[model samples]
Target: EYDAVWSKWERDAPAGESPGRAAVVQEMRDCLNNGNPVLNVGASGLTTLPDRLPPHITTLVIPDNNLTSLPELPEGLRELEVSGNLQLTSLPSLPQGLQKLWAYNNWLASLPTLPPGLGDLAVSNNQLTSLPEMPPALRELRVSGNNLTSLPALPSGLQKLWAYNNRLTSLPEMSPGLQELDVSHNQLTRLPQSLTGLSSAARVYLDGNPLSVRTLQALRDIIGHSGIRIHFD
Candidate 1:
């Protein structure tokens, strides 16, 4: 089945284009037979990708390119990193089995729904204002260096959340299981009133904000009672 597809691609490719693209195509063919290939096409100056990729590829790294969009991804893909693509504005639908996505340093203004099995997401340094509801299985989320003013309800199983350096004026209710929270360098004027629900050992950074006198006092009282480590300097 793949051979027929490859033959058609070979015949259809522009005469001078095949020489450069053929190398990656051959690599893809080799990877198909070897199982669980990691395709690293970073810094290749590619404006586009092949119409299809090997269905079994587990990891796809395509950073530092000029790509503006991506083709349909294989369903079995596990990890995807497409950072440093300054022209990229959006992503294709993610594979359901995807566990990690590092799409930082792009020009994306928004993202699609996250996959259910996603565990780690680093979509920082974009222009996103809000995110979709998080998947329950998510553990780590980083959305710093954007223009966000608010966030969605957090998942109960989340462990680490980094949402600093945005334009946020307030925060959503935090999950009890959250261990590390960074909301610094924003316009926040108060901490969440439900801050007492976090564990005593949780580390929270609230620096670079103009907290009101009442909000500051509330945070101090919460710290005094719960022993949660809070940074406000």
Candidate 2:
């Protein structure tokens, strides 16, 4: 990766006077000379990023802006945050090197297949109801606040899951790597007997649900040594 820092020159510029602008310019120069991992070009409604951005731009955090969609990203990019844009409809395939991706509060209905390298993902409060096959490397997922009534089989590598406030009536087999699960405020009638799969989970949230007493007991028995917290309304 290039050992150069690239700052936003359009909005981050300093006031008039040789000293002020020069100092800001010098800071930009220093950042370019050193290798920084993160870059923030946000709150400017930036339509696009410069094609000449530093090759070391691994993590990009840009939220609450007017971007309609993202452009082709750097090959080394690992994490991306693009939230609170209500206009975005679809996204092309994400970078294969990405480890975490956050695209919440948008109008997306479905996501393209995720790259296998992803570890953390959040697509909450969107129109998505079902996800494509999960990548094996995924560790954390937050797909709550959607229209899903059921979930497909989950990958065996999941560690944390936050899928609340949906229309689910039941869940599929819980994975062994699962350590946290939240299925609150749903229409579920019962918890699955296969919840024993989540043997490692320490905490689970099942509040605001309409579950039968028998189903609740089944869940309590399967989550060995882990506390199951429930909420009723």
Candidate 3:
């Protein structure tokens, strides 16, 4: 399935500009020949991927490349890691079976709709100001080092949220199952009262913000009465 697509790609490559095309194609063919399910094409310095990938492949890792966009992925893909693609601006629609996505340290200003079954997402160190709706199955989310001012509704099963080092002044309600929360290094003046409802073993980091005395006391009151730990230094 991928040979025909690569043939077209090679045919379209500008004369004398398709650096290492033959080698990359040969490598891909070798992997397919070996029946490997995971493809590690990272650090290839390629500007693009073949128009199509093998249908049986399930994992794709293309980090440290020059790709600005990704091609359509196979439906059975389960994990995608495209981090450190400094030129990457956007991602293609994710496969439904995708479970993990690690696209940090890119130039993305926005994101596509997350797959419903996605459990882990890390899009930190980008330019995102907001995110799309959270997937119900999401468990861990990291959106730090962006321009975010607020966050969308969190998933019910979420356990960890790392949204520090942004421009946020406020946040959405905490998920009932949230166990670790970090909103430090922002412009927050107070925390949501709903935070008091977090799990007894929850650990919250609120340092690096200018919280009011009242807000500090409120948090202290919660900590004094519950097992939740709040860090303010």
Candidate 4:
């Protein structure tokens, strides 16, 4: 990434004056010495990225940019965010050690296969039609405002699911430990009997679906419970 730093200097820095060149150099250099780095270059309007990344970088925050593509990631990276890049349509394979990936509000039509250790994923407000296989450790999935007609089988440990405003006719079996669920503005006519994973607890948003009379009655019982907070209207 030093190449990126130098190029950025050449493009913006005047001949004799380079503001924060020492500061930026030292900041990144310190991390290199320390062996655990976080590279945050968000909203910089970069259409391209470096071909090589530092192997020591643990996190990469590159959101709200104009980048159209991403290179192969470093194996040591644990967290990544490429959100709010309006031009991105697809992505490369993810690292095996990745735990978090946030790519919301892009033009993505599909997603690469998720890593098994991933716990949090957010691909909201994209053009996706279907998702790849889910990871075992996945807990929070935010896939709102897409063109999905159905969903893949949910993972067992998933807890927070927000899948509103899609074209889904139904939902997959939910995790029993789920604490927060929002599946509004779809075509659901019935839900499984395990509607309330409502523990210590949380909320459910199931309004705007074409629920059946029996389904509505069951949901009424769920909404009637004191511990559950819902928006079924």
Give lDDT tens digits, candidate 3, residues 120-158.
999999989889999999999999999999899999999
The sequence of per-residue lDDT tens digits that candidate 2 reaches over residues 1-233 is 22122234434433433343344334334445666677665454444433344556788776665556766677788998877777776666787999999989887888888888999989899888788888888889898999888887777888888889999988888776677888888998877665654554246788878887777666555543455443444
Backbone N/Cα/C clashes per model: 0, 4, 0, 0
Evaluation by lDDT, superior candidate among 2 and 4 = 4
Task: lDDT for model 3, please.
Answer: 0.85
Instruction: Write out the backbone clash pairs for model 3.
Output: none
Q: What's the lDDT for residue 144 in model 2? A: 96
* Residues forming the 10-long window of minimal summed lDDT in candidate 1: 12-21
Off by over 4 Å in 1: 1-23
Cα deviation in Å at residue 1, candidate 3? 5.4
TM-score of each: 0.90, 0.77, 0.92, 0.84
- Runs in model 2 lying further than 4 Å from the true structure: 1-34, 47-54, 217-233
TM-score of 3: 0.92
Clashes of 2: 4
Local accuracy by lDDT, each model: 0.84, 0.71, 0.85, 0.79
- CA error at residue 140 for candidate 4, angstroms: 1.0
Best by lDDT: 3
